[PDB]
Design a protein around this nucleic acid. Structure first.
Ligand SMILES: [Cl-]
Ligand SMILES: [Cl-]
Ligand SMILES: [Mg+2]
Ligand SMILES: [Mg+2]
Ligand SMILES: [Mg+2]
Ligand SMILES: [Mg+2]
Ligand SMILES: [Mg+2]
Ligand SMILES: [Mg+2]
Ligand SMILES: [Mg+2]
Ligand code: NA
Ligand code: NA
Ligand code: NA
Ligand code: NA
Ligand code: NA
Ligand code: NA
Lengths: 154, 186, 160, 140, 95
RNA sequence: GAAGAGUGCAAGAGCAAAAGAUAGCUUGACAGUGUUCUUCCCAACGAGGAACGCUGACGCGAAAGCGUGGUCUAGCGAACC
RNA sequence: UUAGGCGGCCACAGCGGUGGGGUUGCCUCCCGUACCCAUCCCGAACACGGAAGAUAAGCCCACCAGCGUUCCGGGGAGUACUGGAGUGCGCGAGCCUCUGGGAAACCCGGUUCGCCGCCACC
């Protein structure tokens, strides 16, 4: 299970690349999503590669982001342990977070919006003109790397 | 053979056994074929249909297992041929087969030949086959008359292995009647 | 005319003589020099001239540089010295020229040129260890008369 | 093995290459059977522009007709070494050709399951001279 | 295109590879298909008759009956539906 | 000696117990009416063209079968009179 | 299939080569023209009639890789070419990094001297 974050805008983006982002439920810059690692899903993120940031987040980090940025299918409402408990098949954020990482359920299945709308990266990111290997922020990241980005977009 | 760009004929073409141009025209009818084939000593008749992995033979007869009903004479002749066709034709009617198209392979359509005799037999056995009466030999030559008249010019007995001297087209008649019976093992 | 007009590879391959008529003859007198009866493996040293950029060299340039290099080997080794140089390229690409304005602009045949990819050996000489410095100088003059920069490279020769 | 390996005469082709025929009359009386016309292909400067038209005649002799004829033809010629085919044939002269080969030849001349005769079972230049010289005359 | 005939730009798709030269096996020319069946369209260079327009080469239609020995196969060119007359010599069962 | 020959004419493609050659016979280069594709990729548009059927009458073959001109893509023309 | 007939795939099956096998069985060669039929001339062939002889051809069986073909290993080669991205380099023709694919020739070594279906038969 990987985490996708849109880091580059739509203007001048190939139409078919932008439509993939929309199929993966992301419509704006700084919007995140969780995707199971399958042959099909893997094809979609490779195509989006040069406009996103992805990787496998740690149990904790995911919990923090879920705590802070997750939302229900409708309305504001804080998604906390109590909320999770009264609406999900779990007991707390952690139970949800564990099931996600293990690809046992989805945010939709539990009645939550598929998208985590993040805040801009505190202290700024590593640039959107180069991949991670060249000192940038685009492409596949480490678990440490993805956590760094997601925790900054707390 | 000579190189990469070289063309090697289909196997049954190298073997000089199948006329593919005639075979196709044969298959276009949609009906099963009546495979009329001869040998120096024998004759053969098969009823073949098309199948996913190769032809399926639904019925057949050989001039050898002819004697099984009464034969005691040569098998590479006219009387032999007709009777083998009728035999095969009857086993066919038994399998639920109703019609066929004559397939003579690499033989020639000479009037009054053995492949035609084979064909007449199967028609007599009750099979619906496209033919032309005035191409089939006259009834007497089928019986083995032409051969009796040959030994009529005796001097030196025609048949080595004794079956008789003047030979018997009557044996042919005995055999035809034996097969026309309904009980007979097929 | 200037080589600036034909040095780059910016057109399709135009070599089919079955559709091109009136192609000028090549100015390249000979491709095999020195002692053609002797073998290449019969020499201790072997130095080739390597082209550094991917370019097109007209037959006029091939003749001029081949000439001015071999002319040196003949001057320093003699009309029958012990060596053998090789121009391993032949001019296949046919050249046009629009010599009315831009109306019906397909040009007429004016020449021929050899296409050489960067890293390929244009010339290759074979000589003994003594004459090794002459072949280098002959090549120095040769790369002075062709478009690209060149590397004089000694292949089999650890007698340096 | 030897019986089904011993040489025989397949045919003797007697032919007269003329150029435009009136020679048929004699070619039949020398052999015994009917002759056949001979046409041509391609245009020729020697006034031979008409493709299909009479030029020569021939007669292919088989069995008795062949030997009986040879019992007069052979004596009329002088056999030589080079005068022999690689397959074991020979021509001399009006021309007279003799095709020889062993028993299992029908295999290559029949229609069904026909096959080319193996190089081994084929007659040889030497095997020919022998068999023929062994029939009323001398070799080289 | 310098011209607009049916065989324009068909040098590659309507030419047999050397080793496949000559007459083709009767088996596939007499094959039988059922309605609703999915079939691939591809002309056999060796078979002259029963051909369709070369543009359609590479399609995958659906058999919807027949007209004589030939078959009526439905396809969608771009966004327009079309019905193609074609013999089994130029057809193959999908899957 | 699997194809370089030949097959009317450009070029590309097809063809070997043939689509080529020879021989013999025959006039299907037939009348009537359609389905489809093409003309015009997708996507509307005439004439023209082709493939594939049906009805009718025939040619050849033992028969399956082949013949809606020439192996395939050029050789074409509205209304009014 | 101890020798047969009809086939599918249509060279992995081609080219060439060695060895083995048949009395009333099989397939052949073979023997022979009164007939059906036949050759623009020939019972050669086509066709008909038949077994004195043979296993030398063909055929069936076992087998050899020199040529040709199929596939595979290692090497060439993650090379050549390439779909997405870059305020990366170069005067420029052009190149390079990241991401996703990925070759041909050739050398060496294996492989391949057909597989499969139906019918009949000691
Ligand atoms: Cl047969
Ligand atoms: Cl069409
Ligand atoms: Mg909402
Ligand atoms: Mg700030
Ligand atoms: Mg920045
Ligand atoms: Mg092309
Ligand atoms: Mg036509
Ligand atoms: Mg007017
Ligand atoms: Mg033997
Ligand atoms: Na002008
Ligand atoms: Na220079
Ligand atoms: Na073919
Ligand atoms: Na029209
Ligand atoms: Na004539
Ligand atoms: Na054999």
């Amino acid at each position: 299970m990987h985490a996708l974050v849109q880091l580059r805008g739509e203007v001048n983006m190939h139409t078919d690349i932008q439509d993939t982002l929309e199929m993966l439920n992301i419509h704006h810059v700084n919007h995140c999503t969780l995707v199971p690692e399958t042959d099909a899903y893997r094809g979609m993120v490779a195509k989006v590669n040069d406009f996103v940031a992805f990787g496998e987040p740690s149990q904790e980090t995911l919990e923090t982001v879920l705590a802070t940025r997750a939302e229900p299918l409708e309305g504001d409402a804080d998604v906390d342990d109590e909320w999770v408990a009264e609406h999900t098949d779990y007991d707390d954020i952690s139970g949800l977070a564990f099931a996600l990482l293990s690809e046992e359920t989805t945010l939709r299945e539990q009645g939550l919006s598929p998208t985590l709308r993040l805040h801009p990266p505190r202290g700024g990111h590593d640039g959107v003109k180069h991949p991670v290997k060249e000192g940038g922020q685009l492409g596949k990241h480490d678990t440490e790397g993805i956590d760094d980005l997601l925790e900054a977009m707390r | 053979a000579t190189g990469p760009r070289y063309k090697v004929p289909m196997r049954r073409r190298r073997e000089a056994r199948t006329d593919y141009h005639q075979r196709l025209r044969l298959l276009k009818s949609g009906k099963p074929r009546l495979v009329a084939r001869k040998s120096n000593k024998h004759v053969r008749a098969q009823l073949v249909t098309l199948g996913p992995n190769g032809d399926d033979t639904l019925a057949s007869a050989h001039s050898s297992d002819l004697a099984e009903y009464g034969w005691e004479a040569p098998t590479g002749n006219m009387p032999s041929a007709y009777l083998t066709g009728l035999l095969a034709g009857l086993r066919a009617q038994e399998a639920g087969v109703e019609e066929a198209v004559l397939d003579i392979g690499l033989n020639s359509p000479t009037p009054g030949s053995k492949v035609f005799a084979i064909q007449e037999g199967a028609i007599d056995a009750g099979l619906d086959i496209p033919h032309n009466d005035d191409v089939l030999a006259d009834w007497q030559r089928t019986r083995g008359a032409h051969i009796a008249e040959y030994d009529e010019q005796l001097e030196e007995p025609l048949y080595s292995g004794d079956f008789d001297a003047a030979d018997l087209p009557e044996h042919f008649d005995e055999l035809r009647e034996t097969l026309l019976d309904g009980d007979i093992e097929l | 005319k200037p080589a600036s007009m034909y040095r780059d590879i910016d057109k399709p391959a135009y070599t089919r003589r079955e559709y091109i008529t009136g192609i000028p003859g090549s100015k390249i007198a000979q491709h095999k020099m020195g002692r053609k009866q002797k073998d290449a493996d019969d020499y201790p040293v072997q130095i080739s001239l390597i082209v550094e950029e991917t370019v097109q060299l007209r037959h006029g340039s091939l003749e001029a540089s081949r000439l001015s290099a071999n002319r040196h080997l003949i001057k320093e080794l003699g009309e029958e010295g012990d060596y053998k140089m090789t121009l391993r390229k032949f001019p296949h690409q046919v050249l046009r020229e629009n010599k009315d304005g831009m109306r019906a602009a397909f040009g007429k045949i004016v020449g021929t040129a050899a296409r050489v990819q960067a890293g390929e050996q244009l010339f290759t000489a074979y000589c003994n260890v003594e004459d090794a410095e002459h072949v280098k100088e002959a090549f120095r003059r040769a790369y002075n008369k062709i478009t690209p920069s060149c590397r004089i490279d000694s292949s089999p020769a650890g007698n340096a | 093995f030897h019986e089904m390996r011993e040489p025989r005469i397949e045919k003797v082709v007697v032919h007269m290459g003329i150029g435009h025929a009136n020679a048929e009359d004699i070619l039949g009386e020398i052999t015994g059977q009917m002759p056949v016309r001979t046409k041509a292909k391609r245009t020729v400067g020697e006034f031979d522009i008409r493709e299909g038209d009479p030029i020569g005649a021939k007669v292919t002799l088989r069995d008795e007709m062949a030997e009986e004829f040879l019992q007069t033809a052979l004596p009329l010629a002088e056999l030589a070494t080079s005068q022999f085919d690689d397959t074991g044939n020979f021509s001399f002269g009006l021309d007279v050709t003799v095709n020889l080969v062993r028993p299992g030849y029908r295999v290559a001349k029949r229609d069904k399951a026909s096959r080319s005769i193996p190089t081994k079972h084929r007659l040889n230049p030497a095997d020919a001279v022998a068999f023929i010289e062994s029939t009323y005359d001398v070799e080289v | 295109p310098s011209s607009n005939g049916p065989l324009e730009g068909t040098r590659g798709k309507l030419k047999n590879k050397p080793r496949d030269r000559g007459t083709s096996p009767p088996q596939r020319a007499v094959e039988e298909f059922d309605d609703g069946e999915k079939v691939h369209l591809k002309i056999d260079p060796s078979v002259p008759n029963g051909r369709f327009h070369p543009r359609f080469d590479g399609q995958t239609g659906t058999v919807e009956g027949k007209q004589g020995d030939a078959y009526k196969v439905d396809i969608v060119d771009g966004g327009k539906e079309k019905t193609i007359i074609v013999t089994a010599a130029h057809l193959r069962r999908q899957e």
